[PDB]
Amino acid sequence: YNVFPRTLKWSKMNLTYRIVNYTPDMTHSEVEKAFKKAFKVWSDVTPLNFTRLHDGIADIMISFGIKEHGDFYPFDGPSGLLAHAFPPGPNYGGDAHFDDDETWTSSSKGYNLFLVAAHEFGHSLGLDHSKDPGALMFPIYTYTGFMLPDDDVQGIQSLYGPGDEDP
Numbered sequence: 709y710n711v712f713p714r715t716l717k718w719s720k721m722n723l724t725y726r727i728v729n730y731t732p733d734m735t736h737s738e739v740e741k742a743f744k745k746a747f748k749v750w751s752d753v754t755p756l757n758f759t760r761l762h763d764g765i766a767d768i769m770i771s772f773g774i775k776e777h778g779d780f781y782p783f784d785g786p787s788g789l790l791a792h793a794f795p796p797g798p799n800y801g802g803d804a805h806f807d808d809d810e811t812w813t814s815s816s817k818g819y820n821l822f823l824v825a826a827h828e829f830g831h832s833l834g835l836d837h838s839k840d841p842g843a844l845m846f847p848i849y850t851y852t853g854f855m856l857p858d859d860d861v862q863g864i865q866s867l868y869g870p871g872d873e874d875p
């Protein structure tokens with residue numbers, strides 16, 4: 709027999725993601741690089757591996773949408789809500805949605821896609837919000853010109869372990 713896990717997390721270390729569609733604001737390459745770097749934040753400190761799929765069903769489906777876009781969390785136009793992601797699980801579990809009424813960038817302007825994605829992927833992997841104002845998982849956007857803060861390291865490692873501690 710098996711009882712359910714005590715904590716919510718992926719039961720496998722190999723995860724896939726798919727960029728379903730793209731924001732007008734950035735090139736396809738810029739978007740891909742931002743998401744690749746955001747996953748690397750987490751894989752660098754765990755045994756997790758992330759592989760991109762171009763099509764089909766991935767664990768973490770990524771999309772840009774506005775207003776009502778297929779879930780119970782409609783976006784709200786410019787400002788306010790920026791993005792959200794679902795905790796590990798089937799279907800919408802793990803998926804990350806970005807409000808395409810925001811301006812997404814690879815700079816300090818607008819909202820930096822890499823930084824927001826790194827936060828959202830923390831949710832995709834099983835972290836909720838942190839009370840440390842300096843944590844990536846703190847629930848308000850700040851721009852930083854990357855080192856994953858220790859609170860986030862401790863949180864993600866509590867779920868998945870550290871992987872190789874010196875890679």
Ligand SMILES: c1ccc(Nc2nc(CSc3nnc[nH]3)cs2)cc1
Pocket residue numbers: 790791792793823824827843844845846847848849850
């Ligand atoms: C860097 C990047 C982002 C953050 N923190 C962020 N917090 C929010 C709002 S809280 C929330 N989480 N999902 C939906 N809404 C959006 S980006 C912190 C540091």
Ligand SMILES: [Ca+2]
Pocket residue numbers: 783784785786787788789790807809810
């Ligand atoms: Ca918004």
Ligand SMILES: [Ca+2]
Pocket residue numbers: 766767768769797798799800801802803
């Ligand atoms: Ca999913």
Ligand code: NA
Pocket residue numbers: 731732733807808809810811812
């Ligand atoms: Na936009």
Ligand SMILES: [Zn+2]
Pocket residue numbers: 777778779781782792805
């Ligand atoms: Zn959504």
Ligand SMILES: [Zn+2]
Pocket residue numbers: 827828831837847
């Ligand atoms: Zn959040």
